């Protein structure tokens with residue numbers, strides 16, 4: 001029993017991920033100095049990114065967890081009105097899901113909204129959505145690991161890997 | 167801006183936590199060899215423990231996330247009937263919540279159910295519940311950090327700390 005990488009074109013080590021997440025955390029801490037952000041994790045794929053990210057943000061903050069599908073499974077529990085909100089996503093593909101979520105959150109009138117996403121495949125972008133804190137921009141490929149699944153499996157791989165289009 | 171420990175009687179470093187979680191992961195991997203566990207994370211407090219734990223279990227597995235309160239906020243999404251289920255909890259206090267959850271899960275007839283909890287305060291136990299994979303047994307105190315909150319705050323501290331009864 002060992003963690004094995006797929007043969008896809010995208011591969012990112014736990015160490016590389018670790019270093020990038022720490023930089024993003026430091027960036028957020030700096031940008032939100034003097035404030036109390038409310039980080040909203042988009043389940044299920046972003047829960048590991050969320051876990052590592054928050055531990056790299058030396059600020060007083062709160063968090064929530066929600067589920068959403070393309071075209072809202074889990075609702076918000078804490079108020080976001082007037083809060084400085086930070087959405088934590090796993091990967092931005094077409095951008096549809098994030099687009100719906102941002103409109104949903106904006107309807108409640110938060111003080112501000114910024115987005116943190118571990119990955120982004122801009123060649124697949126169909127709706128322009130903002131990503132203020134991006135881990136890595138990658139080519140078009142189906143990735144998995146580090147929270148992201150492959151038919152519900154492989155969310156436990158400590159690294160990001162992928163399969164071939166075939 | 168820096169992570170600061172409270173003055174309570176319970177203090178556990180990120181390093182100590184890291185080492186213990188890795189041992190538990192190795193234990194699960196060994197016990198569940200040849201099987202495909204389904205880990206159910208009890209939100210919100212156990213999401214960091216969950217993130218680190220799964221990355222220390224070199225086995226094919228699936229996961230889900232649910233919310234529950236003393237005396238069921240977020241429901242199950244994946245089937246558990248016939249599955250070898252592992253509940254991932256943050257801390258066992260009176261044991262009431264875990265007791266309800268186990269009965270809930272058992273009603274669906276899983277193949278087996280085992281429990282992993284980062285912490286346990288047995289002096290506060292009112293209902294005997296099983297913990298097959300325990301991180302640390304601690305004295306009675308209100309802890310926070312590493313996913314656990316203090317009025318919704320401090321879930322981001324990379325270590326477990328606590329406050330004084332006063």
Ligand SMILES: Nc1nc2c(ncn2[C@@H]2O[C@H](COP(=O)(O)O)[C@@H](O)[C@H]2O)c(=O)[nH]1
Nearest residue numbers: 045092093094095096097141142143148149
């Ligand atoms: N596991 C995995 N999920 C993906 C990938 N690309 C997109 N997704 C899923 O699709 C969701 C939204 O994609 P989008 O709405 O931007 O098209 C993401 O949050 C993610 O859960 C991928 O390459 N691997």
Ligand SMILES: Nc1nc2c(ncn2[C@@H]2O[C@H](COP(=O)(O)O)[C@@H](O)[C@H]2O)c(=O)[nH]1
Nearest residue numbers: 211258259260261262263307308309314315
């Ligand atoms: N943050 C924090 N939460 C606790 C503590 N003790 C109990 N809880 C919360 O209460 C829930 C269940 O407690 P129980 O049902 O065993 O009495 C736990 O899952 C946890 O969320 C504590 O010391 N600190």
